[PDB]
């Protein structure tokens, strides 16, 4: 394999080769015999663990083929036979972290270019964060690259196939993809600490996340606000340091511009003050208005 891998990477850097490899991994992975699935996940593991970082960053369909190999690799973690599931989980451990970073960069490139496949990739990426979290599967530079990519996908107004068999425009739908990314972002800050202030790196990145989290989320017929209320309660329950650090910007945007979302609203305002020294001026006064809202939005 150590001899075979740069030769096969030289083969897939050429036209007509990616289709053959696509059909090979389709007939190997989607087989009705589970031993073919077994042998496919071991072989795609052996290609993944003998890869480099900068050696792939010139060819497009090489990155596409390695991205489809990696997404089938991540898809086999949840397969219906338990042996392939436990093997993919344990064989994910034995991959050197530069190769996983290069695979994540290829998958992020394929997320950047290809349009119609953004449902599945985020699910795979959530599984990636759920399993291999020491590598920055999600980080603030990742979110600022996706922020500028959704800006170029939103504020601007291919030929390859879809990798959906790997598993199987200016108002709403791109904004729904933005909302989905917000839900993944709330899951990220609920899950990990992610201390961007502990290092001098990622200060502008996290700063860009809060600024544009203010700007694009600040127009009461959207799906983002209720999910933000649904997420920030678990955020404040699990995180404390970044939770206190982000609180005042949460309350600035609460009414900046409905039964069950009222229930999560009062749960939000329940966990605003449970362990948090909020006590300032010209801001606490609006809590008086809040109990006025106890006789305003009820009346």
């Amino acid at each position: 394999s150590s001899l075979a891998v740069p030769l096969l990477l030289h083969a897939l850097s050429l036209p007509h080769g990616a289709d053959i490899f696509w059909t090979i991994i389709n007939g190997n992975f989607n087989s009705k015999d589970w031993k073919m699935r077994f042998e496919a996940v071991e072989k795609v593991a052996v290609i993944c663990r003998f890869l480099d970082i900068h050696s792939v960053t010139k060819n497009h369909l090489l990155k596409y083929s390695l991205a489809h190999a990696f997404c089938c690799f991540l898809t086999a973690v949840e397969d219906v036979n338990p042996a392939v599931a436990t093997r993919a989980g344990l064989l994910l451990d034995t991959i050197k972290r530069p190769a996983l970073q290069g695979l994540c960069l290829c998958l992020d490139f394929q997320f950047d270019t290809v349009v119609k496949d953004r449902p599945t990739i985020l699910s795979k990426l959530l599984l990636l964060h759920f399993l291999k979290q020491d590598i920055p599967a999600l980080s603030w530079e990742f979110f600022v690259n996706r922020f500028e990519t959704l800006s170029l996908e939103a504020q601007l107004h291919k030929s390859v196939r879809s990798l959906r068999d790997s598993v199987k425009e200016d108002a709403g739908i791109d904004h729904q993809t933005v909302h989905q990314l917000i839900t993944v972002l709330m899951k990220f800050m609920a899950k990990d600490e992610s201390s961007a202030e502990s290092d001098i790196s990622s200060a502008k990145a996290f700063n860009t996340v809060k600024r544009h989290l203010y700007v694009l989320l600040g127009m009461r017929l959207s799906t983002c606000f209720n999910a933000f209320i649904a997420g920030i309660a678990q955020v404040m329950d699990y995180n404390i340091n970044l939770g206190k650090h982000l609180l005042p910007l949460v309350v600035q945007v609460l009414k900046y511009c409905k039964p069950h979302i009222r229930q999560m609203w009062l749960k939000a305002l329940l966990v605003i003050l449970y362990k948090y020294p909020y006590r300032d001026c010209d801001i606490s006064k609006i809590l008086l208005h809040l109990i006025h809202i106890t006789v305003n939005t009820l009346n």
Partner: peptide, 26 residues
């Protein structure tokens, strides 16, 4: 609705645990 009743329950616990948070002398 029991939602508004539980809202008064959690404002009740909110003030029961600590009076300084809501209306100390207000």
């Amino acid at each position: 609705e029991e939602t508004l009743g539980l809202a008064i329950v959690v404002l009740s616990t909110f003030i029961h645990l600590s009076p300084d948070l809501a209306a100390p002398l207000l």
